[PDB]
Copies of this chain bind each other. A is one copy, B any other.
Amino acid sequence: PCVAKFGPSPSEWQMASSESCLNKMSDWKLRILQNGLYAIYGRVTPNPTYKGFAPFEVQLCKNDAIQTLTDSSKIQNLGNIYEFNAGDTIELRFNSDDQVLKTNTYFGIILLANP
- Report the minimum CB–CB distance from A104 to chain B (whole Å): 10
Query: What does DSSP make chain A's interface, helix, strand, loop or mixed?
Result: strand
- How many copies of the chain does the oligomer comprise? 3
Complex CA distance for A3 and B5, rounded to whole angstroms: 24
Task: Report whether A110 and B80 are in contact in the complex, using a CB–CB cutoff of 8 Å.
Answer: no
In the complex, the chain B residue whose C-beta lies closest to that of A5 is: B115
A35 to B59, CA, bound (A): 27
Range for the number of chain A residues in contact with chain B: 20 to 34
Q: How does the 8 Å CB contact mask read for A84-115 relative to B, with 1 for contact and 0 for none?
A: 00000000000000000000001010101111
Does A79 contact B80, Cβ atoms closer than 8 Å? Answer: yes
| Contact, CB under 8 Å: B79 / A82 | yes
